[PDB]
Subunit: 168 residues, 3 copies
């Protein structure tokens, strides 16, 4: 199911490069140094973050723009969370710019698609266990990623994958 959607439009030229220090996370800063078109990168990340918080519905409840990072796998932006924002396990994101930047965020909750490595008996007591793979056990849970991560690391368990979301 779709949890929320967000769209954001901004004129690239009117976005200051000095905003980099306020909006970017640490891994985004490393990616920023690699970038040839610096003003576009900042504008794009601002738009993606705005679209993300629009998709949540509550906006900036107690969160900062640095709490949400957009990294890159291949050429596509990928969501990285440093806080619990909800129980969505998929963030489908897209970004385009031509003088104006337009960012799209669609948040989705899929049944399952959460991979955890650990004792079978431990997991079946707490979660609905669906399938076994090379990566680990596939479970269904509505627990937010950091809540789940803290619960599992207390035991001899490990969160392998949480949908398509990157954690920390």
């Amino acid at each position: 199911m779709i949890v929320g959607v967000g769209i954001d439009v901004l004129e690239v030229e009117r976005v200051p490069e000095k905003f980099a220090e306020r909006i970017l996370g640490e891994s985004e800063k490393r990616l920023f140094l690699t970038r040839k078109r610096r003003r576009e990168f900042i504008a794009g990340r601002f738009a993606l973050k705005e679209a993300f918080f629009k998709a949540l519905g509550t906006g900036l409840n107690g969160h900062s723009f640095t709490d949400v990072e957009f990294l890159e796998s291949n050429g596509k932006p990928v969501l990285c969370v440093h806080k619990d924002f909800g129980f969505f396990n998929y963030a489908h994101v897209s970004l385009s710019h031509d003088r104006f930047a337009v960012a799209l965020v669609v948040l989705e909750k899929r049944k399952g698609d959460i991979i955890v490595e650990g004792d079978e008996s431990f997991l079946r007591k707490r979660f609905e266990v669906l399938e076994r793979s090379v990566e680990g056990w596939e479970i269904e849970t509505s627990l937010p990623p950091f809540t789940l991560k803290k619960l599992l690391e207390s035991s001899g368990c490990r969160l392998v994958r949480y949908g398509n979301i990157l954690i920390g």
Copy 2:
């Protein structure tokens, strides 16, 4: 499942404020009076309505722009229908503007998420009943909101919530 999607882009400056009388519903007019940036509000509502009808696929079949309202809960636009447009029970909407307004509408049909208060036996004869809550009975139906509303009010039943759609 996704029923349809709609996107709309328009230059705010070229949208006349005089269009307010043609496109806005009564509750939108009350919201319009509160607004400081009047031209932006009109442009945004025009874009949202256009995106909505694009998401339907049939366009303006026999409908008017006043048949669809976009109100506000918190800071997010919320769909309010005054007519039956389909059996979607979720409208995920977003709006952004920076000289150009961009509106996004995603229509979704979720299993259930329709809350009805009334006699248990009456409902089980007609609908697949899923869960009981404080708000009422959760049912699955493909009946459009006004069709459902008219059917229930004929008996001693009441439509409490239809997904995230506002009715009337």
Copy 3:
């Protein structure tokens, strides 16, 4: 479930009409001749194709812009594939332009919604068969449309409908 999303923005005026020969498929060329606003049409089709490949995630793996066509039913763009890009069976698309063109593509995999005509016994050996209609048998499969089409035409079977995707 949502397979991927894509957004694209481009300034219409800076898109050359000469790009028509490079980006358009044969059926799009026939539609292009009918169009009064030629520059808008090209800009829109470029934006839709870009949004489509963004939604795939891999980009232009071994594909061309001519491998993907956007035709029209009523007034809405409709996806036509000439190659296998994935197992999504729904492409929800939208296009708007006002000096800048904005295109949206949402790719979805729905359970079922693939209609095939043929021998009941042949299909039940290979696929999960769901329902019978006037158009044919509804099956669930993760086979891409051309792979499925080639498999069925080898026997006395025919692919009737693949979600809302047009094939060839």
